[PDB]
Every structure is written in structure tokens, then in C-alpha cells.
């Protein structure tokens, strides 16, 4: 096994600007026919990958004019003109030379734009959900750039660290945001014997925690 | 007109196998190997093997080896791969891919992939609760609500809001699994104006189970 390795997990641009994605290798896909065994190809992101660039320096059928590889020994480097809208995603390196194939890590592309604030909203259980024995507080923070972002569970003023389920979308290809909805489950007899319960986010878009809440008898 | 159909979705349970397909069109079927590769859910990407199928010569990973069994079938332009001894750890999708070996070595064209879940066995419907704040000002225009669909197995969910009239605004969140179940919800921005006088019920589809809910959120 030759173990294939990219730098970066993702690597943020905006459009228009030129994009430089690395690539390294275990030994050294040389040849002496000439040629360097590498391979690009570029996962987008509920699609199929696609062969961009071929033995190193060759731009494959259909491929644009933008794209471009170089590098030598285990050094490799994949650079895109100008960055638009469709070559969002995954790229993925790969080396054909020695068995098995080896595939790196990957390589994200994502988008850059002004910054954005959360617009975040809490949600009591539902009267149904509650006969059935549960109760869950789901808090959604909607659009908002950047991906990073904290949300802090507070029940009557305490913590809550165990019992919360987040799940965050992939970068919107309409507005470039980013949303996430943080979960939170109780048994319904934890939940009957507290007050107030507090959905926190620190985000960069506010010098202070954004805070929503709601309170159990409150009508 | 070149393309590669695999099969699709695949429902297995441990223990037992599978045959994956993936036909190839557009093109001379023989005159160009076929690699297979597998992927986790987002750990990366891997070689399986290829087959020649002008003979079947297969040239496997080590590691996939006694596991993996390509097998061609120049009837017409069909490919298969069979899995056997499935574990948890081969849940994942599997790509298979086509072959310029001689003058490129370019894998050119894919496949859509197959997910294969190999679970614990389970299969249960979801359950519906809808999600409507707990106090909303007229100046607070944008208003948002939800739907949280918890308690499923397995994948997917066919989240709708109105009838599919609700286009915009709508955030379906990708599901996490529980314990042994799925769970997901979905948002919605809707005026002030509207969602007062005007009714709005999330159409919640489980293929699955064969079960349709709708319910209204008050």
C-alpha cells in the first residue's frame, strides 16, 4: 500500500479567484516511460466523480481550459483558474501504479462570500411526541457564513451535554450559506420538572452568544 | 450517450450477500476493464478490482479478496459484484468505473453507485410531530416551522411541505442515525401573513414501509 495524503480537508475561495488543492504521495509514481501516475478526479457531491486530469499533466476529454496539474516526485498540484459555481466539491488524488490503487483523503472546495448571521429559532416538543413518552427541543439556526459555529444546551441555567443531536447542510449553491439543527431529547418526566431551556449559538457575526429560549408555563 | 446504470439500493442483512450490477451502454463492452470502487459514508475512497471482459482475468485488492467476486456477462454489457459475508463495515456505496487501459489508464466514465445497509435487522415507520413555536409577534414576519420525523429504518424520507407547493425556504436536514434508527427534520420561512390563516402540513413519505403522513402544524 502506497498511502496517498491531502494537506487540507477543505480550502475556502471565492469566485473567480485561483485555487491551488495539494497532493503527496508515500514513495514516488515515476516511471521511466517519462510519465508520473497520478490521477484527479472530482466527486459534486450527491454526483459521480469525474477524471480531470490524467499521468500528471493531461487535461482529460470535456475538462475546461482552467484546470491544471503539475508537480514531480511525490510533490503534486492541482490549480483552477477561475473558480465557478459547478466545481464545488470533493477532489479526490489518486495514484496507479503499484497494487492496490491507493485513493487520498480529499480535498474540499468551498465558497467564500460575506459574512451572515444565524438566524436561529427554538421549538418546544409537540403535544403528540409528549403522549408517546419523549420530549425533544429542536433549535434551527438557518442560513449562515461561516460553517463554524457553537450551540450550548442549557437547561435552567445548567449545561446540557448529553442527550443533543446536531446535523448541518451542505453549502447551499444558491446563496453560499450554511445551515444546522441542533436537537435535544429528554424523557418526559425530566422534562416536566424543568422551567426554561435555552438554545445558545456563538457564531462570529455576534460580539455576544445569540440566545433563544422559551419557558414552560409561558402562554 | 456513453453511460454506466448500477443497480440500486441494496437490502441486506449480516451474514448474507449481494450481487451488485452495473450495466454499460454507448460503447464496445470488451474493449475496456472495469474497476469497482467502494465508499464509506465520508471516510474517503477505494480500489476493489477490475475485470477484463474480453476474458474474464480479475485482478483483485488483498484486502477485498475472498469478499469480492467480479464476474462479467458478454450476453450483451452487464457487470456484477457479489459480497459475501457482509458486515457492518461494508455498508457504504460502491462505485464502478470504466477503464482506458492501454494508451491513458484514465478511468473515464462512472456509474451512480449502489448503497448497500447491512444492519442489525431492523425496519420500523417513523412517527410525525410537527413543529410550531411557542410565541409569535405580526412584527416578526418571517415565520418558521418544522417537522420532525423520528424513529425510522431504513433510509430515505420524502419530506414535502405543502404538496410540493412550498418550494422556497424549505431546509430538510440530513438524518443522523440514533441507536438503531433515523431521525431527521425540515424547516420552513414562511411571511407572517400567511401561515395564520393559511394551512401548512409537511407530506412525510416512507417508502419502506409503504405509509404516508400528513400533519398539519397549529
Known amino acids: 500500500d502506497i498511502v496517498m495524503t491531502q494537506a487540507a480537508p477543505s480550502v475556502p475561495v471565492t469566485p473567480g479567484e485561483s485555487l491551488s488543492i495539494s497532493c503527496r504521495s508515500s514513495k514516488s509514481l515515476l516511471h521511466s516511460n517519462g510519465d508520473t501516475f497520478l490521477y484527479w478526479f472530482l466527486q459534486r457531491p450527491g454526483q459521480s466523480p469525474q477524471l480531470l486530469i490524467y499521468?500528471?499533466?493531461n487535461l482529460a476529454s470535456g475538462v475546461p481550459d482552467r484546470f491544471s496539474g503539475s508537480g514531480s516526485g511525490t510533490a503534486f498540484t492541482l490549480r483552477v483558474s477561475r473558480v465557478e459555481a459547478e466545481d464545488v466539491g470533493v477532489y479526490y488524488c489518486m495514484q496507479h501504479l503499484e497494487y492496490p490503487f491507493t485513493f487520498g483523503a480529499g480535498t474540499k472546495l468551498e465558497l467564500k462570500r460575506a459574512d451572515a448571521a444565524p438566524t436561529v429559532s427554538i421549538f418546544p416538543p409537540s403535544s403528540e411526541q409528549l403522549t408517546s413518552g419523549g420530549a425533544s427541543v429542536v433549535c434551527f439556526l438557518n442560513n449562515f457564513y461561516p460553517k463554524d459555529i457553537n450551540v450550548k444546551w442549557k437547561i435552567d441555567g445548567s449545561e446540557r451535554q448529553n442527550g443533543v443531536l446536531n446535523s448541518w447542510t451542505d453549502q447551499d449553491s444558491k446563496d453560499s450559506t450554511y445551515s444546522m439543527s441542533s436537537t435535544l431529547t429528554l424523557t418526559k418526566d425530566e422534562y416536566e420538572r424543568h422551567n426554561s431551556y435555552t438554545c445558545e449559538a456563538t457564531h462570529k457575526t455576534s460580539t455576544s452568544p445569540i440566545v433563544k429560549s422559551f419557558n414552560r408555563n409561558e402562554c | 450517450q456513453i453511460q454506466l446504470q448500477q443497480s440500486g439500493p441494496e437490502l441486506v442483512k449480516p451474514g448474507a450477500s449481494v450481487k451488485i450490477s452495473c450495466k454499460a451502454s454507448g460503447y464496445t463492452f470488451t474493449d475496456y476493464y472495469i474497476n469497482w470502487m467502494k465508499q464509506k459514508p465520508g471516510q474517503g475512497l477505494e480500489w476493489i478490482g477490475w475485470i477484463d471482459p474480453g476474458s474474464g482475468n480479475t485482478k483483485y485488492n488483498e484486502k477485498f479478496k475472498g469478499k469480492a467476486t467480479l464476474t462479467v456477462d458478454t450476453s450483451s454489457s452487464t457487470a456484477y459484484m457479489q459480497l459475501s459475508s457482509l458486515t457492518s463495515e461494508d455498508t457504504a456505496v460502491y462505485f464502478c468505473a470504466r477503464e482506458k487501459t492501454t494508451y491513458y489508464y484514465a478511468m473515464d466514465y462512472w456509474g451512480q453507485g449502489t448503497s448497500v445497509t447491512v444492519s442489525a435487522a431492523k425496519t420500523t415507520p417513523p412517527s410525525v410531530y410537527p413543529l410550531a413555536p411557542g410565541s409569535a409577534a405580526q412584527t416578526n414576519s418571517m415565520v418558521t416551522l418544522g417537522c420532525l420525523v423520528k424513529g425510522y429504518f431504513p433510509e430515505p424520507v420524502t419530506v414535502t411541505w405543502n404538496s410540493g407547493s412550498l418550494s422556497s425556504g424549505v431546509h430538510t436536514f440530513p438524518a443522523v442515525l440514533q441507536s438503531d434508527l433515523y431521525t431527521l427534520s425540515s424547516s420552513v420561512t414562511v411571511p407572517s401573513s400567511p401561515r395564520p390563516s393559511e394551512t401548512v402540513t409537511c407530506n412525510v413519505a416512507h417508502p419502506a414501509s409503504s405509509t404516508k403522513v400528513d400533519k398539519k402544524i397549529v
Open positions: 499521468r500528471m499533466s
